[PDB]
From a paper:
The third enzyme is 2-C-Methyl-d-erythritol-4-phosphate cytidyltransferase ([name]), 4-diphosphocytidyl-2-C-methyl-d-erythritol (CDPME) is formed from MEP by reaction with CTP12. The subunit structure of BsIspD was of a compact α/β fold from which a long β-meander extended. The core of the enzyme consisted of a seven β-sheets (β2, β1, β4, β9, β5, β8, β10) where all strands were parallel, apart from β8 and β2. The β-meander lay between antiparallel strands β6 and β7 and made the major contribution to the dimer interface, and the lesser contribution came from the side-chain interactions of the residues on the α-helix fragment at the C-terminus.
Two crystal structures of BsIspD have been determined in orthorhombic crystal form with space group P212121 and P21212, named apo form I and II, respectively. In the apo form II, only one molecule (molecule C) was retained in the asymmetric unit, the functional dimer was formed by the sysmetry operation. Two flexible loop regions (residues 13–14, 226–232) were not built in the final model, because of the poor quality of the electron density. In the structure of apo form II, although the residues 13 and 14 were not built, it was clear that the P-loop shifted upward from the active site, since the Cα atoms of Gly11, Gln12 and Arg15 shifted 4.5 Å, 5.8 Å and 2.1 Å, respectively, meanwhile, the side chain of Arg15 flipped to extend to Asp81 which moved about 3 Å. Therefore, the active site was more exposed to the solvent than that in the apo form I. Moreover, the L1-loop also rotated about 30° and moved about 3.0 Å. Here the residues of Gly11 and Gln12 were too far to interact with residues at the same time, only one hydrogen bond was formed bewteen Arg15 and Asp81 (Arg15 NH1-Asp81 OD1 = 3.3 Å). The structural difference of the P-loop in the two apo forms may imply that the P-loop was quite flexible. The chain-to-chain superposition for 223 Cα positions revealed the r.m.s.d between subunits C-A and C-B were 0.41 Å and 0.46 Å, respectively, while the comparison on the dimer gave an r.m.s.d of 0.59 Å for 446 pairs of Cα atoms.
Residue numbers in the entry:
A (entry chain A), B (entry chain A): 1 to 12, 15 to 225
Write the structure that this text describes.
């Protein structure tokens, strides 16, 4: 059915007003492009944007500049990405499917979200990923220590979709024992019996941090 | 000092004339864009293009359409990438630095090649790579089996630069015992005491296979 989306926007870090999500892409902040995807999606009930308190005013101003039909809440985060995601998930008001999504990934398609909601509802946890295409090596001090075996390796994207109860439990367990995950899926993996499934996404679902990313973004738009 | 470059162009596979390297990028085949990089590079002595015999005529026609100052030889390859690279290295006429390079990586910069020649000459073997930015997971039947620990992982590019004697030895040893490597560095790694170093490259040094790659290419050009 429907979902809430939590987007961590605390910078896991820049000074107030200088969030990487405010970098303009064809004249609109990256975050705007991302927000419009979830706004136009019929099954997205609400957007939870997890922020640093200092940047609240900047986000408020930005949202008044760009109004949306879909409800958007600014929820204060913490000092790490995981802590922030969890404070976000604490603002979901009933049991339902929850997505967690990178603000700087504006090219997610409603098709992919739909497929991810189906899996999360079916089995509890799902992530978007694509096959790794390049050889991967582990390297100590610019010296190759090994070549990682490529056959079944996937590059992980967002969103990641979960039953709220499940992801909440995975966050609580992790926090109670001081485990620091990378992405949300790794918290579920860390639980006993915890299981996560993959929906294959698209190579266009890129994350925009650096200026070369903008250039690649501007070409994905125009196309 | 100077080097030969071997470029495997046997399709490790398409029918004759339909090589992926003939896909036109702003009106010139991808291979042309790549060849121009090595042609304009003062230290490149020779280009060895390893082909399927069937496509010889197509390559010959393509080269007469685009003349180059730098000498280019068409050398017949084998049925795998490794076998083809090795037949290529067999046409290098004296001991020197040899590069091996993907035909479909046209955005290599002379700066990067220069840094790679320095390392290969210094320590014997060098590769271009960039830090992995995304979470990597191993996945069986769309089901995550593990999260690969990210801190020291690099995505490997070409070229890879070696002392000819060293890479030749690594190829001979591998063939004598039927070992099938992925890239050339993995053949050197497989030798006793074999050691390979990393030069950090650039995120623009992309490989062009799919149509989305073209679009990303056309934007890297224009920029």
């Amino acid at each position: 059915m429907s979902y809430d989306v939590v987007i961590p926007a605390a910078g896991q870090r820049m000074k107030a007003g200088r969030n990487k999500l405010f970098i303009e892409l064809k004249g609109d902040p990256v975050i705007i492009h991302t927000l419009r995807v979830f706004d136009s999606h019929r099954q997205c009930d609400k957007i939870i944007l997890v922020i640093n308190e200092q940047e609240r005013e900047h986000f408020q101003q930005l949202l008044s500049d760009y109004p949306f039909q879909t409800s958007i809440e600014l929820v204060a985060g913490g000092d790490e990405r995981q802590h922030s995601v969890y404070k976000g998930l604490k603002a979901v008001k009933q049991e339902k499917i929850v997505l967690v999504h990178d603000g700087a990934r504006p090219f997610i398609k409603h098709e992919q979200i739909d497929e991810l909601i189906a899996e999360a509802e079916q089995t509890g946890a799902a992530i978007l990923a694509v096959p790794v295409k390049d050889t991967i090596k582990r390297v100590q001090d610019l010296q190759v220590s090994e070549t990682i075996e490529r056959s079944s390796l996937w590059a992980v994207q967002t969103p990641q979709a979960f039953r709220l109860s499940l992801l909440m439990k995975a966050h609580a367990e992790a926090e109670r024992k001081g485990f620091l995950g990378t992405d949300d899926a790794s918290l579920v993996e860390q639980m006993e019996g915890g299981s996560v499934r993959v929906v294959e996404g698209s190579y266009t679902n890129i994350k925009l941090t650096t200026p070369d990313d903008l250039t690649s973004a501007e070409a994905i738009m125009e196309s």
